[PDB]
Amino acid sequence: MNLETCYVDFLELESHVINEDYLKESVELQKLISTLNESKFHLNKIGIHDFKRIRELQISLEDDLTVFVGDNGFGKSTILDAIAIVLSWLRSNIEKESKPGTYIKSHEVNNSVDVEYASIDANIKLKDFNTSILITKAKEGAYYSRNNELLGVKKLASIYRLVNKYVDNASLPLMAYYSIARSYIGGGVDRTKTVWSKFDVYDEIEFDRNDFTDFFQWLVFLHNRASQEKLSESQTTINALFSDIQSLKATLTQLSAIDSTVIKGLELSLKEKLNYMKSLQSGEHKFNNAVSLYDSVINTILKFLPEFQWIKLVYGDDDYKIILKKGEVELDIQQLSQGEKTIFTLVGDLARRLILLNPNLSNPLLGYGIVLIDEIDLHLHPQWQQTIIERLTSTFPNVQFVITTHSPQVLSTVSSRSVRILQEVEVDGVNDLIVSHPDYQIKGVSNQDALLYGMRTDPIPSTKENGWLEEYKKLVELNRYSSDEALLLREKVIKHFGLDHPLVQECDDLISVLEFKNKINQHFS
């Protein structure tokens, strides 16, 4: 059952029947929703032409994990920036039809004489449904003008709008971007929406400062709502709320007679109260308890911090405060280290976004989407580096990640089929970018081999003492080790490393075996 065939079938059926009730229970709608649910969202290919410092490039992206490795001046963050531009258009069309996205501004084009325009090409694959988008911009004063092609994106976003129009519990894809400025964001220095909708997340793509404050407000509201569930309040509370809403409506009617801001505020409060009443009706129809979501978030954060016992909200000084118990000491959020603050903000933001975007799923941590992370190993000691990847791909298994790293320890825990190495090779006097793969499998090997193969760098420093050891080794292997010069070199080595060092012991073993080989040959000659 191709997605397009069910889409056109529902489109042609919509025109005939005018009644919405029949459409809501139509068989075609059920088929479209069913085939939409298992359609995994994932990007396929990307290409760059004359964008910033990049001349040309073609990159194929895996569906589960991709890692970029290599140092150079063009900057790997540029590649992530290109992807951020493309996904912005997809989000805009979902919000409203034909809404403009993000254009390529003038100065990002290359400054070379023989350039005229810059282009970005991308492709999105959903099972057997393929779409492509091209975004381009030409220099000022060019003879020919270029325009973007938005047919595929508009068609893809129309399906989501159609499904979301008839069903109020539709799930939407997730897009996020974590730049390197989150280090300041997660500082949490000492600097109230009654209802939350899934459209709030679509306001911005890049992680920002206001997200932490929204996280605090959302946590407070969720805990307060779970308090009513704990109290097991009966339906009389709904009756009291209805009475208050009726009184507010009467006040609004009195206000309409013989204060525009007051009227707007009263109308907004009435709408919020009506939404709360509809939430109470859904409570009668039953739903996932706020307690289950509360401990789902708490346990999710606690999975990445094994050194903490519990996290709680304490009401004091007419305000709320987060208390974490480590060992036998209670601590505040501001007293944590930089690494724990970074992990706390990253996981909290991801959990909030996924929970808000899937109100209908029993386990909201299984939604689809794409997440781009830059410098995954910020403020992390080597012990945490070897387990961050496994925990990330185990808590959220249905999300595609794109990551750039700089540490061999992280690189030693990923498969060799997800590693792309970027190298600049000067050919014919012109530097060219190429992409290669590791020679051998690097998952499970020591971090020294991962540095030797995955990064192509010598894992041994070039200090002066290394030259002494190498020179002594050459003499030993060359069998004229018995000389005054070797004795002088050896005295230096013993003085620096010491006689008990394993490296010196290896050379001693090499001497001893060579001495024994002629002895045994002479014995049985």
């Binding site: 010491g498 008990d500 394993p502 012991q505 073993d509 075996v513 024994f516 045994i520």
Partner: protein, 225 residues
């Protein structure tokens, strides 16, 4: 672990000490130095339990060592100054002496290096793990199961296992070459006995005074025809 050949007693000032006086902390530095003189002689330069090097060939007091009693002081108080209860242990805060006293256990199921040969129970591996030999009865199997648990000599990863693996892999070149020569000799045609004898005595000469000497010995003899 390795079997310890205790020499003639050398308690010295220990004999002058009295049980009724007690006051283990009252021992002066001179007595501690005298004790260490004999202890280093009997124990070599290796820890009794983990066999990590404890004394380095002569700026800082590296590898801090503390004198440990085999039995608990509280309930075997009569052996506070007993000569046979003296042992030397490293300063690692996660194993050996500093880890023995933090648990509750039966005192009759512990292996003593000066009484029974540890080679009967344990069998080391190239990767650095410890494997209990099969065919033992119930009481010996329980004894070997508990001594490793109390001494933390069999961790899941890291700890002493990583160090043992690194030490084993550093010395594998000598073992491979020695068995390479052995093969030749044998094939060519020479009195097996002779070959054996030599390949052993020489290896024992070249392995004396080294870190984790039993793990290397076990690996070598496993691959030595």
């Amino acid at each position: 672990m390795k079997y310890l050949s205790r020499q003639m007693p050398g308690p010295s000032v220990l004999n002058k000490f009295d049980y009724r006086r007690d006051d283990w902390n009252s021992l002066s530095s001179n007595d501690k130095k005298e004790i260490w003189e004999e202890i280093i002689k009997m124990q070599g330069k290796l820890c009794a339990y983990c066999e990590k090097k404890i004394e380095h060939h002569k700026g800082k007091n590296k590898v801090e060592r503390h004198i440990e009693h085999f039995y608990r002081k509280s309930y075997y108080k009569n052996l506070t100054f007993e000569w046979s209860n003296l042992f030397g242990s490293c300063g690692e805060p996660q194993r050996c002496g500093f880890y023995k006293d933090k648990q509750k256990y039966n005192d009759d199921d512990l292996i003593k290096a000066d009484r029974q040969n540890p080679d009967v129970f344990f069998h080391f591996l190239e990767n650095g793990d410890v494997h209990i030999r099969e065919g033992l009865n119930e009481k010996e199997h329980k004894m070997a199961e508990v001594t490793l648990r109390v001494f933390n000599l069999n961790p899941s990863s890291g700890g002493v296992k990583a160090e043992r693996r690194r030490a084993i892999e550093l010395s594998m070149t000598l073992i491979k070459e020695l068995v390479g020569c052995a093969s030749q000799l044998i094939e060519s045609g020479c009195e097996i006995e002779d070959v054996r004898s030599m390949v052993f005595d020489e290896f024992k000469k070249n392995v004396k005074d080294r870190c984790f000497t039993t793990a290397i010995k076990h690996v070598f003899e496993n691959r030595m025809p």
